[PDB]
């Protein structure tokens, strides 16, 4: 029964921001993340977490809020926002045993089904956009 804690990652740009299909929540959509590695600040983690699934690089990493989503495992999920350090790359499917493809998505009309605990925050306002 243990608690862990991802990072999730609201990549933007311009207005839409970085979706995946993942293969917890299969086939639904959902915002890049992955656990925590002992040793990381959050923003290490994301900026991971994106090379690792897009091969992305991105910057300007911000902390958005946390939430509490229970499964045997608990996951304090950590949004940070972030931009491409070079907004002219798009993502690349490096991962697909975890995810179908990327794509961006405008916050207005995101994708269903969304992995429940991205549409749990969604439901509560959640914007990353400044």
């Given at each position: 029964?243990?608690?862990?804690?991802?990072?999730?990652?609201?990549?933007?740009?311009?207005?839409?921001?970085?979706?995946?299909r993942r293969r917890?929540?299969d086939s639904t959509?959902?915002?890049?993340?992955?656990?925590?590695?002992?040793?990381?600040?959050?923003?290490?983690?994301?900026?991971?977490?994106?090379?690792?699934?897009?091969?992305?690089?991105?910057?300007?990493?911000?902390?958005?809020?946390?939430?509490?989503?229970?499964?045997?495992?608990?996951?304090?999920?950590?949004?940070?926002?972030?931009?491409?350090?070079?907004?002219?790359?798009?993502?690349?499917?490096?991962?697909?045993?975890?995810?179908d493809?990327?794509?961006?998505?405008?916050?207005?009309?995101?994708?269903?089904?969304?992995?429940?605990?991205?549409?749990?925050?969604?439901?509560?306002?959640?914007?990353?956009?400044?």
């Open positions: 029964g243990s608690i862990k804690v991802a990072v999730v990652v609201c990549l933007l740009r311009g207005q839409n921001v970085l979706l995946g917890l929540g959509f959902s915002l890049p993340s992955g656990h925590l590695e002992f040793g990381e600040s959050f923003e290490e983690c994301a900026a991971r977490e994106l090379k690792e699934e897009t091969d992305l690089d991105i910057g300007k990493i911000e902390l958005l809020t946390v939430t509490n989503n229970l499964f045997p495992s608990q996951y304090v999920a950590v949004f940070m926002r972030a931009v491409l350090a070079d907004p002219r790359q798009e993502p690349q499917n490096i991962e697909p045993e975890f995810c493809g990327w794509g961006w998505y405008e916050w207005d009309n995101l994708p269903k089904p969304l992995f429940w605990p991205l549409d749990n925050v969604v439901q509560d306002g959640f914007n990353p956009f400044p």
